[PDB]
Design a binder for this molecule. Structure first.
Ligand SMILES: [Ca+2]
Ligand SMILES: [Ca+2]
Ligand SMILES: [Ca+2]
Ligand SMILES: [Ca+2]
Ligand SMILES: [Ca+2]
Ligand SMILES: [Ca+2]
Ligand SMILES: [Zn+2]
Length: 316
């Protein structure tokens, strides 16, 4: 829309009030002109045609139950944009301020969210396994990170390359959650998963085995389900990232932690300079070692800790 930038107010999926950047031209649209070439949020109206209609509102107030997933998709896309710009000097997912588009209310009872090659897409959940998935800042940032990966390393979404793809999205989703600094943790999807059960999540980076995922290369899945286990074997890499940041001893191997900020620098460099569409876990180790060497020096603690972390998860 061509109009004037405005600031609306609404409530997200978890019932929290937030301001959102909108545009006015007869209606107020979920179009944020303050970031890049815009952030645009669409209504898929419980159908699967995409993107659907650019979200329009008569009064710039977004407090209806139907509005909540749009409010959060739109707001958390802005947070994720800010993280990549402020922390990594990256302008949108293509590095040239590409428009960021999301659709909410996708299908009926849809227990998932995804990047479809052109935009983010969020289901409302069935109210039992999930509530609307855009309520999770880690979920929104996970999806937008798939766009970043597709424009950079382009990790093929199958087998070991696909597991790295998934782990990169869990890592940056978590780092974005810590950047926004509201109830941050190393779990994925806890804000929107199983409303009737407290304390669980979809996956854990700190303890992948908690939710049945491998935390060592010896326990990797090698069958064909889930594109050869992309959301399963991501646990091996998620654990290595957790260890690089936080430290710990895992199967007897001790890792000196170096903190989230350096974890983010090392993985962002690996993703944008060293990883390729066919990279496997061993090649990820080399890419992370080279990135840490570039940033901190071959004799640094940071390099030593990357090696320790990959050793701890059985990746040579
Ligand atoms: Ca309204
Ligand atoms: Ca959290
Ligand atoms: Ca989380
Ligand atoms: Ca739950
Ligand atoms: Ca599981
Ligand atoms: Ca090829
Ligand atoms: Zn993913």
């Amino acid at each position: 829309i061509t109009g004037t930038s405005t600031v609306g107010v609404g409530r997200g999926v978890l019932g929290d009030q937030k301001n959102i950047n909108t545009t006015y031209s007869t209606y107020y649209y979920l179009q944020d002109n303050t970031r890049g070439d815009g952030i645009f949020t669409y209504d898929a109206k419980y159908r699967t045609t995409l993107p659907g209609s650019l979200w329009a509102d008569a009064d710039n107030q977004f407090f209806a139950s139907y509005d909540a997933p749009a409010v959060d998709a739109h707001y958390y896309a802005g947070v994720t944009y800010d993280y990549y710009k402020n922390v990594h000097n990256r302008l949108s997912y293509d590095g040239n301020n590409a428009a960021i588009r999301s659709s909410v209310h996708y299908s009926q009872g849809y227990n998932n969210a995804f990047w479809n090659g052109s935009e983010m897409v969020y289901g409302d959940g069935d109210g039992q396994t999930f509530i609307p998935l855009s309520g999770g800042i880690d979920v929104v940032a996970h999806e937008l990170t798939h766009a970043v990966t597709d424009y950079t390393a382009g990790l093929i979404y199958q087998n070991e390359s696909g597991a790295i793809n998934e782990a990169i999205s869990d890592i940056f989703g978590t780092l974005v959650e810590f950047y926004a600094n509201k109830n941050p943790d190393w779990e994925i999807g806890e804000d929107v998963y199983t409303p009737g059960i407290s304390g669980d999540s979809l996956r854990s980076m700190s303890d992948p085995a908690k939710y049945g995922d491998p935390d060592h290369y010896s326990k990797r899945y090698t069958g064909t389900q889930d594109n050869g286990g992309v959301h399963i074997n991501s646990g091996i890499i998620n654990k290595a990232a957790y260890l690089i940041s936080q430290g710990g001893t895992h199967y007897g191997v001790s890792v000196v932690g170096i903190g989230r900020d350096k974890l983010g620098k090392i993985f962002y460099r690996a993703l944008t300079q060293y990883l390729t569409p066919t990279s496997n876990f061993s090649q990820l180790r080399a890419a992370a070692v080279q990135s840490a060497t570039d940033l901190y020096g071959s004799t640094s603690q940071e390099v030593a800790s990357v090696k320790q972390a990959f050793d701890a998860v059985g990746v040579k």
